[PDB]
Amino acid sequence: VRKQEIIKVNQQLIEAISNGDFESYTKMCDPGMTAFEPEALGNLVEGLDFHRFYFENLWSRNSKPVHNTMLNPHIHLMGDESACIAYIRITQYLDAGGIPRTAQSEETRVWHRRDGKWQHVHMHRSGAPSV
Amino acid sequence: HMVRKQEIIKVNQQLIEAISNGDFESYTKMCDPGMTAFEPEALGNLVEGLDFHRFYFENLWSRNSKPVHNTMLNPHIHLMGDESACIAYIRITQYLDAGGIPRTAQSEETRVWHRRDGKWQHVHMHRSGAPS
Amino acid sequence: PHMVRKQEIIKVNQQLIEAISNGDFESYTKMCDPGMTAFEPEALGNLVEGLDFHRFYFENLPVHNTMLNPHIHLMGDESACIAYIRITQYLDAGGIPRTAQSEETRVWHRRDGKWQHVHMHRSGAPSV
Amino acid sequence: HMVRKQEIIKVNQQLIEAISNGDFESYTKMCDPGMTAFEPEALGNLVEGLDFHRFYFENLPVHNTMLNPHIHLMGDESACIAYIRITQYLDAGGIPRTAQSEETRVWHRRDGKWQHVHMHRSGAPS
Amino acid sequence: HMVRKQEIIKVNQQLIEAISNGDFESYTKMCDPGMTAFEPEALGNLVEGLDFHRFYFENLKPVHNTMLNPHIHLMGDESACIAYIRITQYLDAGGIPRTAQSEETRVWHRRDGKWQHVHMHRSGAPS
Amino acid sequence: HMVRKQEIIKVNQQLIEAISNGDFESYTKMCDPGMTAFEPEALGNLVEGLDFHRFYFENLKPVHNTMLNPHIHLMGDESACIAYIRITQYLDAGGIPRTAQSEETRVWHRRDGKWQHVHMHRSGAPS
Amino acid sequence: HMVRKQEIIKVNQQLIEAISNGDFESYTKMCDPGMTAFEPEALGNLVEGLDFHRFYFENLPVHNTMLNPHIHLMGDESACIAYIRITQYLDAGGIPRTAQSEETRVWHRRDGKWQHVHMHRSGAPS
Amino acid sequence: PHMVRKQEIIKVNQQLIEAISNGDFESYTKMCDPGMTAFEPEALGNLVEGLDFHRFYFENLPVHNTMLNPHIHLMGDESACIAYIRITQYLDAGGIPRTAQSEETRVWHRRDGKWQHVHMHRSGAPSV
Amino acid sequence: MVRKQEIIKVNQQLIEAISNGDFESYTKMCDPGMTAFEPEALGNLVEGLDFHRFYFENLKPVHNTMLNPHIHLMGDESACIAYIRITQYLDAGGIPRTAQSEETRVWHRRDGKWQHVHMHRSGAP
Amino acid sequence: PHMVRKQEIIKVNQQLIEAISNGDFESYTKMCDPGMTAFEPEALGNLVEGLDFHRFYFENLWKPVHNTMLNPHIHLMGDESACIAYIRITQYLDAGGIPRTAQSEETRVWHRRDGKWQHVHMHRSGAPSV
Amino acid sequence: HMVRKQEIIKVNQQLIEAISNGDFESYTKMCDPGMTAFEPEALGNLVEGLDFHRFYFENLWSRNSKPVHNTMLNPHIHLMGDESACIAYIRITQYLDAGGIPRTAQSEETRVWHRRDGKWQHVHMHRSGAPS
Amino acid sequence: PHMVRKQEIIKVNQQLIEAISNGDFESYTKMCDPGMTAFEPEALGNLVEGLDFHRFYFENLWKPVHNTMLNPHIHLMGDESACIAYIRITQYLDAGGIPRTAQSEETRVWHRRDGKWQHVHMHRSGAPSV
Amino acid sequence: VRKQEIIKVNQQLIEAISNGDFESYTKMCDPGMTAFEPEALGNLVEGLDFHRFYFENLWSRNSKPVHNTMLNPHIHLMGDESACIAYIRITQYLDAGGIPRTAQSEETRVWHRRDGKWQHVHMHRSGAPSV
Amino acid sequence: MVRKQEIIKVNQQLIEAISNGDFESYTKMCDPGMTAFEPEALGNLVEGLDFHRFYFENLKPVHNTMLNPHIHLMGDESACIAYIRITQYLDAGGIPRTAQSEETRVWHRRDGKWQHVHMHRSGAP
Numbered sequence A, M: 001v002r003k004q005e006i007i008k009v010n011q012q013l014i015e016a017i018s019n020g021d022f023e024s025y026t027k028m029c030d031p032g033m034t035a036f037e038p039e040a041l042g043n044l045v046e047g048l049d050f051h052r053f054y055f056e057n058l059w060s061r062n063s064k065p066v067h068n069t070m071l072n073p074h075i076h077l078m079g080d081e082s083a084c085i086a087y088i089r090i091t092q093y094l095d096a097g098g099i100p101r102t103a104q105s106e107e108t109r110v111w112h113r114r115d116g117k118w119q120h121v122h123m124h125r126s127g128a129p130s131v
Numbered sequence B, K: 001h002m003v004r005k006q007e008i009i010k011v012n013q014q015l016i017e018a019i020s021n022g023d024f025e026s027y028t029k030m031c032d033p034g035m036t037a038f039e040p041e042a043l044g045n046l047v048e049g050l051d052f053h054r055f056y057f058e059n060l061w062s063r064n065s066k067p068v069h070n071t072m073l074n075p076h077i078h079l080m081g082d083e084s085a086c087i088a089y090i091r092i093t094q095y096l097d098a099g100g101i102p103r104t105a106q107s108e109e110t111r112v113w114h115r116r117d118g119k120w121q122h123v124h125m126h127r128s129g130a131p132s
Numbered sequence C, H: 001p002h003m004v005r006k007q008e009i010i011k012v013n014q015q016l017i018e019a020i021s022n023g024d025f026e027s028y029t030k031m032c033d034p035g036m037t038a039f040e041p042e043a044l045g046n047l048v049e050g051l052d053f054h055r056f057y058f059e060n061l062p063v064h065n066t067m068l069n070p071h072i073h074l075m076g077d078e079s080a081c082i083a084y085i086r087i088t089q090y091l092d093a094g095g096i097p098r099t100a101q102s103e104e105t106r107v108w109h110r111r112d113g114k115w116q117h118v119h120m121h122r123s124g125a126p127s128v
Numbered sequence D, G: 001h002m003v004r005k006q007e008i009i010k011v012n013q014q015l016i017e018a019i020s021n022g023d024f025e026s027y028t029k030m031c032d033p034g035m036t037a038f039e040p041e042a043l044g045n046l047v048e049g050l051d052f053h054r055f056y057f058e059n060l061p062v063h064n065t066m067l068n069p070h071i072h073l074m075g076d077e078s079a080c081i082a083y084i085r086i087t088q089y090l091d092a093g094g095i096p097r098t099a100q101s102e103e104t105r106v107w108h109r110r111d112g113k114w115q116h117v118h119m120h121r122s123g124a125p126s
Numbered sequence E, F: 001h002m003v004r005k006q007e008i009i010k011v012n013q014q015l016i017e018a019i020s021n022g023d024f025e026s027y028t029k030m031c032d033p034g035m036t037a038f039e040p041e042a043l044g045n046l047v048e049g050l051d052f053h054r055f056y057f058e059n060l061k062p063v064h065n066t067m068l069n070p071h072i073h074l075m076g077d078e079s080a081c082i083a084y085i086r087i088t089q090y091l092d093a094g095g096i097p098r099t100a101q102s103e104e105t106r107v108w109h110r111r112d113g114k115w116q117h118v119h120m121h122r123s124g125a126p127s
Numbered sequence I, N: 001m002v003r004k005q006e007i008i009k010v011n012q013q014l015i016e017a018i019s020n021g022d023f024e025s026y027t028k029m030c031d032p033g034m035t036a037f038e039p040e041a042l043g044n045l046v047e048g049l050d051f052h053r054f055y056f057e058n059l060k061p062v063h064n065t066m067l068n069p070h071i072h073l074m075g076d077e078s079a080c081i082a083y084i085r086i087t088q089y090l091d092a093g094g095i096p097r098t099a100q101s102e103e104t105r106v107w108h109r110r111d112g113k114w115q116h117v118h119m120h121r122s123g124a125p
Numbered sequence J, L: 001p002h003m004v005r006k007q008e009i010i011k012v013n014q015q016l017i018e019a020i021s022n023g024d025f026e027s028y029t030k031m032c033d034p035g036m037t038a039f040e041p042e043a044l045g046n047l048v049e050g051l052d053f054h055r056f057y058f059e060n061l062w063k064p065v066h067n068t069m070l071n072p073h074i075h076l077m078g079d080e081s082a083c084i085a086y087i088r089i090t091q092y093l094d095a096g097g098i099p100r101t102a103q104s105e106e107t108r109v110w111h112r113r114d115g116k117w118q119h120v121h122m123h124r125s126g127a128p129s130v
């Protein structure tokens, strides 16, 4: 049940990403969160400004059909206020010719309850870039 | 915070030492038996337990035929309460290739730690970049 | 009644192929277990569970399919699996007729008297 | 649920270990004489019987991992297991390598004993 | 013998006529409904029936087929096998004249006094 | 009918036995001296006689041939055509196990009570 | 020598110019009905008769050069001419181009009139 | 006597092929007109005249040759030309059996009662 | 460690002047005889400020980020700062893109104000 | 005055380059601050701190080579600090005796610490060592 | 010798002018009808007479759609008596390509001349390098 | 003295480069000896003499460009002759607005003839004009 | 007959080349002869030193079987003391594996009788290099 | 045209000193502050003679040929010579090979002797 709560809070963050809602993303993330991701070219980025840039400049891709599947998530619980979730993300989309395609990425996300709310403190993403 | 994170840095440094020595014994002692791992060698999959990494300790990292050198760069540590932590850093690896030339590889490493029974256990790792 | 039951499975599978050919996702849903699994090229080597992954291809997709000689295994009164080669004739963007081959395994389980599709494994090229 | 799922995982592990041992007589005991197979070695064809696979048992430092198996139970005497197989090996040049294949295996419990009746593999030819 | 091989050349030339004209009906009348085929379009599989070939009749002009020196095996009065190289002259996309070579085996069986095409095997280029 | 197709499967399996053993003599005894052949080794040409195939008997081990689901056409009592996919398991240069697929048509004619191989057509990989 | 060599050069020039005109009825008049041909368009086969070549007369800014022809005279009614043919043409992009082929043509004087009975061409498919 | 004369030309040509197979350049010289000509891959698109060019290949050169169905034209009592496909089975450096195809035209002229080889045109691959 | 905050601030000002195309604020902060190694200069050592003008005049939103800077304080008049710079920009289609470069900047204190005397940049232009 | 300092910095730096060309890690460690940082191609875009990373290349790297320091610019900052920038051009002979030339751009920062000149930071771009 | 070679240079320059103008009339007047030519367009063959080059005058060099420029570089002249000469030089050609960009091509040219009936005739050319 | 001459040569040469960047062949011909010679990539390893060859490029060559003359060295030889060597670095924008840089090494020889400075020879290697 | 003399003098030069006899080559060539050839990279070389270098440094290739054929030479006569000859040269040789190969070059050679002896004054060679 | 023979001879001496590896005769003929553009220097302008030492010390028969030189006489103290240089050498297998370069050399007359003040070479190293 506690694992299912981690799945729900993590899926709420994934919803905020799919809807491009940076306010939902910002409140849901510790303002000191760090990130490894292909867009950062092997560097650890801190704060939310780096990710704000990607939220505000992907409007060319709205209305383009995409669907994201989270595959068999694995959750480590570490007390009552700490959790880590790992899963394969699969993205179905359409290329230029309209042909459906698929991309895979692996995601680790670390969650921490601060002040009674689950906070997103670290993400690690490998595989196909989100852009 | 100023010294608790030093505890996470030292523990993670002992783990990196074990990997560099090919010391699977110390590795197993520092890792939780149900730990998970994303890494290039796993071809995009999530591997559970320590049997997958045992292969690399046995057949490769137990061959000190060439001196190698790892390097942890600028560790960033998150602290989730008193029992849990997460450390993220860049790892640089110097080695000798097939022809004896010094070369360098980069990895990005996330490692998650849980203090269970008064001992830090490695519960999850995510590595990107160079396969070792 | 082994041959009767194999004919039964051939027909149940053909009805599933019909719902796919007609792009009929509702019928496809009625015939598949809600927790079915699938290996297929579109899944990039991963096992996908459920039906949400497959809807994308009913929605965003001059063709003829040839089902070669199927092989059926019966595993008790309420279980079978069928394997066959599928040859697809289609025309690409340039109007050129082309052929693609796939190999398919489908696993069927009769739950409460109704045959349910619970696992598929397709190898070859992505579906056209 | 878990009880029958674990018995299917066991018998599939036994098949996999018989394969890694190159132990064809064990494999033959675990396989129905009329089993079928889709596999890369078969070049898109469905091969029947066990003779085709004897070539690979007779002509062979590895570790095989069976990731998160999914088991469908269909009555008392039928199961389908699906899993990603990771193979850790060492090439000629000694460089360690990994390969991935996806395996569907169908098992029929006959008179008490589980028998391997159909397999579908995609990915690495091994 | 020397007279019957001409009848096989004729029935086979009528079949190639029906192909070149895109006349699936005449083609079907010359083919047994259970005829099998190896051909590049079937990707190494043996295809049975006429549904598979109907796709290329329904979706296919300056075309000329040249049957080169057929070899006929006579196996009694009710069976023949003919083997020949076929050169196809066509205009490609940009109108350039091109040629493609295929090798064809065609087996014929006389059922109720009429020759029926029971099996083909074609190597080379797809149509 | 249902009994005769087994005889064709048998004589054809004996021919493949002679091939796999490298036994040109048994192979020759099953082949009409005027048998023709389309095969990748002949580069699109029809070859007549057995001299051409003798080269591959005289210059060619862990080999296994798998005949997949043959289709037999019976055209009377003295003629048959069999078509099958053959998978060949071999060890290449570096000892690695490899497989190759070919598609084969073989026509048989019963002359004086004995089946003779009169025509073959093979597609796919060279031997 | 030179007298019969010039008559063979003339009749071969007439064939070449009938080809460049796309004039199949002239070409047909100059060719024996049972002539044979090796040519790149035939993909290594020997084609017989004139039907095969009709496709290229019916589906066609060029200049053809016949370099230093070698003529073998074999009695009164037989000659073999061999020559390099250079074709000057303009591609689609308008860029001028040249192509080379080597041609053997065999002529038989029948009842007074020279007839083209065999040709062998290698090089450029044209 | 057209068929008799074609058999005559087939035999004369076969004797020339024999001198080539045996690497017998002296016999080859006896059968070729001193001013014979040749188009062949080894000549790089040029017409070579005489026999000095061909000696190099008799001197610096597990094989079987298959002569497919020849076509003979008769051009009077002392002249013919023969055309045929030649298939060569050989083994490369790695011991692998291989096949090559050539197309050959040969022109024969009976001078003073003896058949002389006066022109050849070979297309395909260089001689192995 | 207290002068390190001062060096971070001065260099952050230079970064902002660069991200704004503010060539006059840039020149105010630079020694007139400053040197530069940079990809845009190929393998040349560039002296002065004329060469840098072209990039202020010719190059919508662009974010230049300093990652974990390292500062060397040398006495009281001299500092060296080294860091990875991450540049987020839009390509031709308006797609977010990221470039990395490694930057070394050397600073000299004159009459209470820091002046930029030498830079070395490698990686992306 | 300042011309004396520029010749002092060029001498200290050519001493460093000589210890580089020798594989003499002993004098290199002497002339370098233990907390020096480094940008270099071998570091793959990362800033490396300390001398362990460089010791690996010194120990595991052993034809006639020639390094010419081209157009050095020295920036003097007070009397306890200098920065030298130059193009290192390396002539050598590869496998086969064919002359080859490589180039790298080098920035070296020096801090006169405890009276001795110390190497606190380097930035190297262009050709790697090997 | 000092002025006779100037005669060979001028005559050869008139020939190059004719080629640049697409003036086949002047070209034919300056060339011997039995002249021979090695050149890249001839694919390694020797062409005899002027019909081969007529094709390039008609279809290409008669299209002044783009200005071009030839250049004779450092002519070297041999004199074989009073009636024969041979001139060898490098030829540079500037032109506009498919996209309108100025480009350059190099040829090496040998041209042989025979004074027949009080007029210099071009009897043989050999060109290497760029095809025009 | 000789410093006045070096600034004179730099000015005359930057005038030439300005006429180059303008496509102003008029002033170019003015500032150049009619018998000047040229090595340049467009000449394919040949020495070209005169100005016709260069006029083709001036007439048939027309985004914001920027040329910076780097580290000029002037050699003065008496008072009627000088030689200037420098690296011309060209910043420009290609198709798509992406900044690009090209480099060429240039040697220019000047002869004060009839009191006016004349361009008698150039050697250009590296990046061509187009 | 005069054309046949040009063929003989030109074949004597070709013999001197095939035998590596630079003395026969040197006396047979005007010391001011010029040459276009692939070895000169598009330049006209003058004198005989350039060609001496190739004579003296090809000993690695002696005993390697080669044969040279001159194809249908075309000769222009220009008076009693001038001539020009053009022909295709075909070279049969063996590669590393012993496999026979062929190379083609086109040759123009200009001859001039000085002091009663045919002198070689200019050569132009295109196609496969002699080295 | 009479000083042109003098320039040809002096430059021919420099060529011979180069072909002999005679670095002292070379230095005798060169201004100590001579400049050089050359492929071996990549895109750098090289000053002095230290850089040229490596090629005299490290580089059997080699023939350096001057092709149709062009000489510019400037007054009475200054000359420029430009020419294609053809270099015949042996490769690793002893096979004759040819390289081309284009060379510009600038000469200054001091006290009756010519000194080499600047060279530009393009093409082959």
Ligand SMILES: O=C(O)Cc1cc(O)ccc1Nc1c(Cl)cccc1Cl
Pocket (backbone or CB within 6 Å): A017, A037, A039, A050, A051, A054, A055, A058, A123, A130, A131
């Ligand atoms: O993946 C995240 O945690 C948030 C994130 C951060 C970032 O720097 C760049 C991209 C993302 N997300 C995203 C993804 Cl996966 C796919 C498409 C668009 C976007 Cl906007």
Ligand SMILES: O=C(O)Cc1cc(O)ccc1Nc1c(Cl)cccc1Cl
Pocket (backbone or CB within 6 Å): C020, C040, C042, C053, C054, C057, C058, C061, C120, C127, C128
């Ligand atoms: O084969 C199925 O069960 C359903 C399925 C799922 C899926 O993820 C991708 C494709 C399919 N079928 C399909 C096929 Cl074979 C061919 C064409 C279109 C479609 Cl829509």
Ligand SMILES: O=C(O)Cc1cc(O)ccc1Nc1c(Cl)cccc1Cl
Pocket (backbone or CB within 6 Å): D019, D039, D041, D052, D053, D056, D057, D060, D119, D126
């Ligand atoms: O997977 C099996 O059921 C048995 C099987 C059959 C077959 O035809 C080809 C290969 C296998 N197994 C195998 C594998 Cl995965 C890897 C290495 C060796 C072997 Cl022997």
Ligand SMILES: O=C(O)Cc1cc(O)ccc1Nc1c(Cl)cccc1Cl
Pocket (backbone or CB within 6 Å): E019, E039, E041, E052, E053, E054, E056, E057, E060, E120, E127
């Ligand atoms: O060859 C036949 O018997 C009939 C046949 C069947 C088939 O599946 C594909 C093609 C064909 N014929 C054809 C050929 Cl050779 C060439 C062009 C069009 C056509 Cl329609």
Ligand SMILES: O=C(O)Cc1cc(O)ccc1Nc1c(Cl)cccc1Cl
Pocket (backbone or CB within 6 Å): F019, F039, F041, F052, F053, F054, F056, F057, F060, F120, F127
């Ligand atoms: O296939 C046959 O009928 C006989 C035949 C003839 C021929 O020309 C070339 C090969 C074969 N058989 C063969 C095969 Cl399939 C595989 C391996 C070796 C051999 Cl020897």
Ligand SMILES: O=C(O)Cc1cc(O)ccc1Nc1c(Cl)cccc1Cl
Pocket (backbone or CB within 6 Å): G019, G039, G041, G052, G053, G056, G057, G060, G119, G126
């Ligand atoms: O060469 C001939 O005899 C006639 C011939 C026959 C043939 O099958 C193919 C082509 C040709 N001639 C041709 C040539 Cl070379 C070039 C262009 C058009 C034509 Cl139409």
Ligand SMILES: O=C(O)Cc1cc(O)ccc1Nc1c(Cl)cccc1Cl
Pocket (backbone or CB within 6 Å): H020, H040, H042, H053, H054, H057, H058, H061, H120, H127, H128
């Ligand atoms: O075919 C001939 O007439 C003679 C001839 C000449 C020639 O230049 C090159 C090859 C050949 N014959 C040959 C052939 Cl087909 C095959 C193998 C060896 C030889 Cl030696």
Ligand SMILES: O=C(O)Cc1cc(O)ccc1Nc1c(Cl)cccc1Cl
Pocket (backbone or CB within 6 Å): I018, I038, I040, I051, I052, I053, I055, I056, I059, I119
């Ligand atoms: O980096 C500097 O100090 C100033 C400088 C000089 C120069 O020649 C080229 C670029 C820059 N700056 C810049 C950078 Cl880092 C990134 C984007 C735009 C600009 Cl405009």
Ligand SMILES: O=C(O)Cc1cc(O)ccc1Nc1c(Cl)cccc1Cl
Pocket (backbone or CB within 6 Å): J020, J040, J042, J053, J054, J055, J057, J058, J061, J122, J124, J128, J129, J130
């Ligand atoms: O260049 C330095 O300051 C020290 C240094 C560190 C390092 O990690 C790698 C190389 C070096 N030097 C070096 C150079 Cl430039 C060239 C050849 C060998 C060496 Cl050993």
Ligand SMILES: O=C(O)Cc1cc(O)ccc1Nc1c(Cl)cccc1Cl
Pocket (backbone or CB within 6 Å): L020, L040, L042, L053, L054, L055, L057, L058, L061, L122, L124, L128, L129, L130
């Ligand atoms: O560089 C010169 O002195 C004159 C010259 C001559 C020439 O043949 C080709 C180009 C140039 N100059 C040029 C340059 Cl560097 C760059 C762009 C345009 C031009 Cl037009």
Ligand SMILES: O=C(O)Cc1cc(O)ccc1Nc1c(Cl)cccc1Cl
Pocket (backbone or CB within 6 Å): M017, M037, M039, M050, M051, M054, M055, M058, M123, M130, M131
């Ligand atoms: O061909 C000549 O005229 C003389 C000549 C000159 C030269 O610079 C280089 C080579 C050659 N001859 C040659 C030829 Cl073709 C082939 C093999 C060896 C030699 Cl040595």
Ligand SMILES: O=C(O)Cc1cc(O)ccc1Nc1c(Cl)cccc1Cl
Pocket (backbone or CB within 6 Å): N018, N038, N040, N051, N052, N053, N055, N056, N059, N119
């Ligand atoms: O060319 C010079 O002036 C001196 C010079 C300097 C230099 O840095 C490199 C090479 C050279 N000369 C040379 C040349 Cl051109 C050719 C072969 C060997 C040598 Cl050693």
Ligand code: NA
Pocket (backbone or CB within 6 Å): C089, C090, C097, C098, C099, E041
């Ligand atoms: Na098709």
Ligand code: NA
Pocket (backbone or CB within 6 Å): F041, H089, H090, H097, H098, H099
């Ligand atoms: Na073969």
